[PDB]
């Protein structure tokens, strides 16, 4: 019954892609939707059975790689952590499949889109249900391949291809980091299986020689794994791919980049917690990177005008929050916020796509307004999603973000203070741009054109059922799962997550701090909402400062253009490497220098030597 | 080209395995850093020079030098992961690379040209070729589930155990390998058509479909269950690892 | 020739500058209620300089206007989705005409 | 266009809609159901549950490896 969970999306993809000519645009949708939905219900029984029944299942099919001791078999591991990711990934995938039935109603190549979605779901399931470090790597790179394929689903566009290739390059650096980490894991424990590594993760206390440096064996492995996590989760080091990856279809944004494949890094950190717990040096790096990513995305997302791009920076900020929540060695809260966000961010993307599709694919907030009366349902749904995202009290986003912030406060260390400060300011910024997105799209006086308003149609049934289900989730699931995941002394996780007794600060997070700290996110959210209203709905529009102050214009350009990452990084790395490819390696090393000392550059003097033999 | 890349490039490595790694165990150890230095820069230089090539057959021909220099890192590691994993790479390379030259041969037979500039938008006129070409693009860029990844990863774990630095430098090979492999596919297959240059098309015939079938089957069969090939070699490659050693 | 070409070309450059400045002004002032006064002032910039008649002083004014516009220009302008540089551009383009597909390409004898 | 109707693709092409996609859809389900039976039978055989469930779970109807690995000292 558990192999069916993983292989139903694979069979659906293999049918809809190999025999889509016989099923058409409707049969290919039915196959994939039915297969993923059956996998989702099977994941529901898996949750009732493993997570709630407290009986994990371990399933090994056949050995994959069998060297002397490099054994990485075809093993599947379903524990409490895996099942949560299953019920998130597969449920969101089924809802996205149902959404795309009506979204891809006029696009010609709908069957290939659904085949790609099913193969992506299959790769994500192989990622989450991975017993080894290699099956995990198999899914970790198949998910990148599927995202690349889906980003340029419209191959005729040029921006889509550029975004897809940039995403592949960034994910390739991440994969290099992950591969180095996996190589480090095998050199220590002589195994790649999770059970043996997590069982023997405490004994080794030796030092290695890595790249002319003497480092700690466990710390180096943890840092190398975190490099891969940064690559996939779009953290401070490698994140420029995610905002550019919005050139794909909206359902691609809602599943490929909102709920899944950005939480892959967080899931890998949480799963490898019995190993990250013994390298305190790596936790500092994780905390710093998460705080930096959250603040940077929050600052970048406040001046964007594209509807889809604003939400991408919200996703980046939420992933940063999860990352430095893992950095405080509290993985239960990280997974809780992951599951919470996978609801009210998928809802946000789906509602934004519903607005865009009805607006003749208009993506600029400067050219929409007064849509609240025209789009009642979608306005309500985006209101629910935004209120959950900002962390409105007694809502799905309130039971996780507030806990993360108060936990960061009570981590009385140098790294914890930095994360607390950045996560506190990011709440204000998140409230500001979330409410700006809500205000400009729906409540400001109309700025659109006559043709867009004339051709308006709200979401039909296939695009409304997933929305309503996600709204119910974003209303109640956080409260329902608050007790089992971030409760005191809960045994829901069982052995999935390990938190050492020394670094356990969950109890003090609740009653050790002033009540003001527990109300800082709400006050900052209210301040951000007030600022957004006062700058958008009613204002003299002092933008003349942006037309008279040179610094203000450059400051506006700094936040708008992703902190000048794409421009600077391109010129100083990509262009430099492109020159390094031709102007030296091809132009001088192997062009004529070998030739001139080779067989014909100067060795053709035999013509000037053999002809002289007549003497 | 299939003979030159499929087999003629496997004489050097086989010659090293049969007559060098055993007849001189002491000489091999002394020259191990020398081979690591040559192979590390060859992987970096060749995988980088590949980006600035414009000929279809001159790009894949540069994808073999990087792959074949990754093999010589595996052989000189002198362990089961290294030597044993280097053999799978050559079998994988002998199938992946020779299949890519069939794909180029398909394009050249119809349209007598090899410049990447003339090619584009074939995804809309030659879909079976695009599907087959993409699959071998994935194999060439070391994707798991393909025969190349098994050999590529086994070499890395065989060299990390001997020298962490050389395994780091060789790991950037798959960074650059995945760069041009997909970037070539985007140019040739994806994009808009160019009716000014070329306008008549014909997808794969019966021969081309059938010819690629053993490559497709033999590439995933080695990529998902390489135990069939591995278990036939461990007795022979383990006696190769130690010859002068007696402990 | 100057009275018909050397002076009239500037009369077209000024139109181009006015168009680009108006579009940029609409881009900066998101709300339509605020764009009106900004556009009125923008045209008042041009409407005050109509008193000139000699080329000796107008040309540097046009150069300065282009220099000013080039630095207060919006970093992220608005582009129609199906217009070039837009988001919907080349999404599902009409396939080119004249392209034909042949059958039985490689057949022995 | 006019030429994309002369190109054979496995996926089906642009705006593909066969006259008998209803019958083909029904067959595809039955084929998927037939290939899913051995996978389910295989899964119920190779799966291991070291821990007895808190409450009667549906997997006890077919799976039989419940509380079998408790003697891990004699594992191979």
């Amino acid at each position: 019954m558990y192999l069916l969970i993983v292989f139903l999306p694979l069979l659906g993809s293999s049918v809809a892609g190999f025999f889509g000519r016989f099923l058409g645009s409707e049969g290919s949708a039915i196959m994939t939707t039915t297969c993923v939905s059956f996998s989702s219900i099977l994941s529901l029984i898996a949750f009732y059975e493993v997570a709630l029944g407290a009986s994990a299942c371990y399933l090994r099919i056949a050995p994959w790689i069998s060297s002397e001791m490099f054994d990485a078999s075809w093993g599947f591991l379903f524990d409490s952590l895996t099942v949560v990711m299953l019920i998130v990934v597969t449920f969101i995938s089924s809802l996205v499949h149902l959404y795309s039935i009506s979204y891809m109603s006029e696009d010609p190549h709908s069957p290939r889109f659904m085949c790609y979605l099913s193969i992506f779901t299959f790769f994500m399931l192989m990622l989450v249900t991975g017993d080894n470090f290699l099956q995990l790597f198999l899914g970790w790179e198949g998910v990148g391949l599927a995202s690349y394929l889906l980003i340029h689903f419209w191959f005729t566009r040029l921006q889509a291809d550029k975004a897809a290739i940039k995403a592949m390059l960034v994910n390739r650096v991440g994969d290099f980091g992950l591969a180095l980490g996996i190589l480090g894991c095998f050199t220590l424990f002589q195994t790649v299986d999770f059970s043996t590594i997590f069982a023997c993760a405490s004994v080794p206390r030796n030092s290695w020689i890595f790249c002319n440096m003497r480092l700690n064996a466990i710390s180096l492995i943890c840092i190398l794994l975190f490099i891969g996590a940064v690559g996939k989760s779009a953290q401070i080091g490698l994140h420029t791919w995610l905002p550019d990856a919005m050139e794909g279809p909206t359902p691609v944004s809602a599943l490929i980049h909102a709920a899944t494949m950005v939480t892959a890094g967080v899931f890998m950190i949480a799963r490898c917690s019995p190993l990250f717990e013994y390298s305190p040096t790596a936790l500092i790096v994780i905390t710093f990177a998460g705080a930096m990513t959250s603040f940077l995305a929050a600052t970048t997302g406040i001046l964007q005008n594209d509807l889809k791009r604003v939400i991408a920076y919200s996703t980046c900020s939420q992933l940063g929050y999860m990352i430095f929540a893992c950095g405080i060695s509290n993985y239960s809260v990280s997974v809780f916020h992951l599951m919470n966000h996978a609801f009210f961010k998928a809802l946000l993307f789906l509602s934004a796509g519903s607005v865009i599709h009805a607006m003749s694919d208009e993506q600029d907030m400067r050219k929409m307004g007064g849509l609240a009366s025209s789009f009642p349902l979608t306005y309500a749904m985006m209101l629910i999603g935004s209120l959950s995202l900002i962390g409105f009290p007694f809502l799905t986003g309130f039971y996780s973000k507030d806990v993360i912030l108060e936990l960061a406060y009570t981590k009385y260390t140098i790294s914890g203070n930095f994360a607390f400060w950045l996560g506190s300011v990011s709440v204000l910024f998140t409230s500001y741009y979330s409410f700006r997105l809500l205000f400009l799209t729906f409540l400001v006086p109309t700025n659109s054109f006559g043709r867009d308003i004339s051709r308006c149609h709200d979401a039909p049934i296939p695009m409304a059922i997933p929305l309503i289900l996600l709204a119910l989730g974003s209303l109640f699931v956080g409260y329902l799962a608050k007790d089992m995941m971030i409760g005191l002394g809960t045994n829901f996780w069982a052995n999935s997550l390990l938190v050492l007794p020394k670094n356990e600060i969950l109890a003090e997070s609740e009653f050790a701090a002033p009540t003001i700290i527990k109300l800082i996110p709400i006050l900052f959210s209210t301040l951000g909402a007030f600022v957004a209203y006062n700058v958008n709905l009613v204002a003299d529009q002092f933008q003349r400062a942006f037309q008279t102050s040179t610094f203000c214009n450059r400051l506006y350009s700094f936040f708008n253009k992703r902190w000048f990452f794409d421009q600077v990084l391109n010129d100083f790395l990509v262009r430099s490497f492109l020159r390094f490819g031709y102007e030296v390696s091809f132009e001088a090393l192997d062009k004529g220098a070998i030739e001139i000392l080779g067989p014909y550059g100067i060795s053709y003097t035999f013509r000037r030597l053999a002809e002289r033999i007549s003497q | 080209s299939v003979i030159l890349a499929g087999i003629l490039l496997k004489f050097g490595t086989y010659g090293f395995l049969r007559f060098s790694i055993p007849m001189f165990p002491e000489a091999t150890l002394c020259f191990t850093p020398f081979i690591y230095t040559l192979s590390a820069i060859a992987i970096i230089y060749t995988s980088l020079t590949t980006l600035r090539q414009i000929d279809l057959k001159k790009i894949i021909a540069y994808s073999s030098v990087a792959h074949m220099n990754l093999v010589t890192i595996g052989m000189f590691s002198l362990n089961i992961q290294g030597i044993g994993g280097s053999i799978l790479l050559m079998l994988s390379h002998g199938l992946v690379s020779s299949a890519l030259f069939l794909c180029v041969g398909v394009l050249y037979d119809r349209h007598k040209t090899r410049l990447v500039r003339y090619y584009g938008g074939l995804v809309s006129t030659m879909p079976n070729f695009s599907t087959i070409f993409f699959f071998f693009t994935l194999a060439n860029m070391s994707l798991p589930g393909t025969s190349s990844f098994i050999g590529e990863f086994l070499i890395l774990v065989g060299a990390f155990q001997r020298n962490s630095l050389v395994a780091t430098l060789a790991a950037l090979g798959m960074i650059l390998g995945a760069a041009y492999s997909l970037w070539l596919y985007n140019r040739v297959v994806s994009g808009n058509l160019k009716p000014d240059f070329l306008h008549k098309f014909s997808d794969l015939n019966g021969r081309e479909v059938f010819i690629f079938i053993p490559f497709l089957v033999g590439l995933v069969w080695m990529g998902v269950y390489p135990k069939v090939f591995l278990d036939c070699m461990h007795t022979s490659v383990s006696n190769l690892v130690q010859h002068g050693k007696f402990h | 020739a100057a009275y018909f070409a050397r002076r009239a070309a500037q009369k077209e450059r000024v139109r181009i500058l006015y168009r680009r400045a108006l579009k940029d002004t609409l881009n900066w002032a998101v709300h339509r209620h605020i764009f009106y006064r900004d556009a009125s002032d923008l045209r008042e910039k041009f409407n005050v300089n109509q008193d000139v008649e000699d080329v000796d002083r107008i040309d540097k004014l046009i150069a300065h206007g282009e220099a000013e516009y080039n630095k207060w220009r919006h970093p992220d302008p608005y582009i129609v989705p199906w217009a070039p540089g837009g988001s919907k551009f080349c999404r599902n383009p009409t396939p080119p005409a004249g392209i034909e597909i042949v059958y039985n390409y490689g057949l022995e004898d | 266009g006019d030429f994309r109707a002369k190109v054979w693709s496995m996926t089906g092409g642009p705006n593909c809609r066969p006259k008998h996609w209803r019958r083909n859809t029904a067959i595809a389900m039955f084929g998927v159901f037939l290939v899913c039976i051995p996978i389910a039978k295989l899964s119920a055989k190779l799966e291991q549950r070291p821990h007895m469930p808190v409450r009667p779970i549906p997997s006890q109807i077919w799976c039989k490896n419940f509380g079998t690995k408790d003697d891990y000292e004699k594992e191979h």
Partner: peptide
């Protein structure tokens, strides 16, 4: 949309780009 019979009687384009043989004959 979900009830109307399709228009494409046979899949577009011949398989392996080979014309079907004469009626009552074989490839």
């Amino acid at each position: 949309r979900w009830a109307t019979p399709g228009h494409e009687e046979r899949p577009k384009g011949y398989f392996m780009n080979r014309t079907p043989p004469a009626p009552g004959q074989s490839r």
